[PDB]
Amino acid sequence: MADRVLALVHYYAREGYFRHVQTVCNEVLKKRPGDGVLTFWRAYGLLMEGNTADAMRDLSSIQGNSDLELAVAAAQLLGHESAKVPDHDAIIDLQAKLEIEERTASDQPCLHLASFYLYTKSKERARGLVERVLRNQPDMVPAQVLLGWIIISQQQDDEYDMLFDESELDDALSHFEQAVEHDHNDLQALLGKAKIMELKKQLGPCLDVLTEINVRFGWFVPALVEKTRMLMMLGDWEQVTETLQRVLAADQQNIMAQAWNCMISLTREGN
């Protein structure tokens, strides 16, 4: 169940936190001592510092596996895309060779690149690559829960909640139902279903399933900070304060905890 290392960076890479990334990358690196995939997890962790060609110093020294060759080819696609000399022809050539080398290949390089290209270089490529992994079986949990979770995380935050709609809400509902039917150990499907039924004015069963599922994870920090604006349909923001203090107890590194607690502090008391 790869959600331990894939999903921890997945919500916070927009925030650009790294501490959870080091925890999960060191976790998967201590699962298997010495690997190109794990060194490239470390490359992905260091790539959010601001340097995109660090993947060349991390994996291209130790590449050779198709898992690592595809990853190095796409990382040097980004490097030539972020290059200084004019190499737009090289950018187009790398894009073509990646678009051909991802399809009709093994699922492991595509999955590992989607784990790598999870925030950088058109992060819809993560869902695309985990979908082309699961074109043989379009009933496996990761791709469907990731698509539904994205189309509900855009609903719950301030991107599409200026005018809240219900179409991709239902698409996320279908994806989460499929994902939780694949396994009840899934994490993002149940939380997204909980925020769906929060948004549709059934606060009772919503809080019921929230109590049902939030006991299954306490060290999953981003799913803990996501309780901010999906608990604020109830009519208060003190539960938002305590669920951000929960994140602070998990790790004193969340900028969104401080920011959102600031934002909700000034509403009522002007505190």
Question: Cβ of 124: how many Cβ atoms within 10 Å?
Answer: 11
Alpha-carbon distance of 42 to 25, in angstroms, equals: 6
- On whether the CB atoms of residues 125 and 114 are closer than 8 A, the answer is yes
- Tell me the DSSP string of 194-238: HHHHHHTT-HHHHHHHHHHHTTS-SS-HHHHHTTTTSSTTSS-SH
Find the DSSP H helices in the chain: 3-6, 8-12, 19-31, 36-47, 54-58, 66-81, 88-102, 107-116, 124-133, 141-156, 167-182, 188-199, 203-213, 221-225, 238-250, 255-265
Alpha-carbon distance of 70 to 218, in angstroms, equals: 35
Closest to 45 in 3D by CA, of 114, 99, 119: 119
- On whether the CB atoms of residues 266 and 237 are closer than 8 A, the answer is no
Alpha-carbon distance of 188 to 194, in angstroms, equals: 10
- On whether the CB atoms of residues 5 and 28 are closer than 8 A, the answer is yes
What technique solved it? cryo-EM
Q: Which tokens hold the place of 65?
A: 């596996």
Alpha-carbon torsion 116, 118, 121, 125, what sign?
Answer: positive
| Amino acid (one-letter) located at 260 | W
Alpha-carbon distance of 151 to 146, in angstroms, equals: 9
- On whether the CB atoms of residues 81 and 122 are closer than 8 A, the answer is no
Rg (CA), the chain: 20
Q: How far is CA 31 from CA 35, 42, 172, 187, in A?
A: 10, 14, 32, 21
For residue 233, the 8-state DSSP code is: T
| Amino acid (one-letter) located at 110 | C
Alpha-carbon distance of 6 to 10, in angstroms, equals: 6
| Amino acid (one-letter) located at 235 | G
Alpha-carbon distance of 214 to 187, in angstroms, equals: 9
